Amino acid sequence: SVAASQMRNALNAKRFEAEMDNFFALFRRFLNDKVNWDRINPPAPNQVVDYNDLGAEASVEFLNKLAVVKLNGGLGTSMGCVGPKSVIEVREGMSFLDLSVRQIEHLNRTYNVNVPFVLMNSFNTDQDTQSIIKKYQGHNVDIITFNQSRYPRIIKDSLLPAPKSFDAPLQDWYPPGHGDVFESLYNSGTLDKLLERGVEYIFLSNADNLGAVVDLRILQHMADTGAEYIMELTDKTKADVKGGTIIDYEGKARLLEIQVNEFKSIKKFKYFNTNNIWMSLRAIKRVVEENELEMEIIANEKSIPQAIYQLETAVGAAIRHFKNAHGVNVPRRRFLPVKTCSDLLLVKSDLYRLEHGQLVMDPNRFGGVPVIKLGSDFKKVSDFQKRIPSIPRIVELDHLTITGAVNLGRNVTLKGTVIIVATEGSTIDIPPGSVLENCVVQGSLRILEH
Amino acid sequence: VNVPRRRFLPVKTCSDLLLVKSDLYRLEHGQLVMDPNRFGGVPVIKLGSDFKKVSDFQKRIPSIPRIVELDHLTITGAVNLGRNVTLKGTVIIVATEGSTIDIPPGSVLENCVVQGSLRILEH
Amino acid sequence: VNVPRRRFLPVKTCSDLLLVKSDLYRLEHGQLVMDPNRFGGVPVIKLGSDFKKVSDFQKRIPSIPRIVELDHLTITGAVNLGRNVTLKGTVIIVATEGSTIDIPPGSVLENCVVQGSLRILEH
Amino acid sequence: FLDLSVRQIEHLNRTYNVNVPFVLMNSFNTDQDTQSIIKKYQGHNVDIITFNQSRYPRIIKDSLLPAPKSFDAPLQDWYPPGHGDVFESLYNSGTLDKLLERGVEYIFLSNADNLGAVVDLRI
Amino acid sequence: SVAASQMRNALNALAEKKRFEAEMDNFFALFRRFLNDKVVNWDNPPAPNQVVDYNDLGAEASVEFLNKLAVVKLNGGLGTSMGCVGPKSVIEVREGMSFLDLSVRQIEHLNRTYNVNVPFVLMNSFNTDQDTQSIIKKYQGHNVDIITFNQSRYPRIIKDSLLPAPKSFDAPLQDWYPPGHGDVFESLYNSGTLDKLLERGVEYIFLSNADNLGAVVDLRILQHMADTGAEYIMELTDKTKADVKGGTIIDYEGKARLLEIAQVPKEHVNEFKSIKKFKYFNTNNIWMSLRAIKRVVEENELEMEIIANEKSIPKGEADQAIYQLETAVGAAIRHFKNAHGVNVPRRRFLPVKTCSDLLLVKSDLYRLEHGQLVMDPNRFGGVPVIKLGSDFKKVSDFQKRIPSIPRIVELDHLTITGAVNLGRNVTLKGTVIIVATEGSTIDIPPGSVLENCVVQGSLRILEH
Ligand SMILES: [Cl-]
Ligand SMILES: [Cl-]
Question: What are the binding positions for UTP in this chain (chain A) (predicted)?
Answer without folding.
Answer: 85, 148, 177, 208, 339
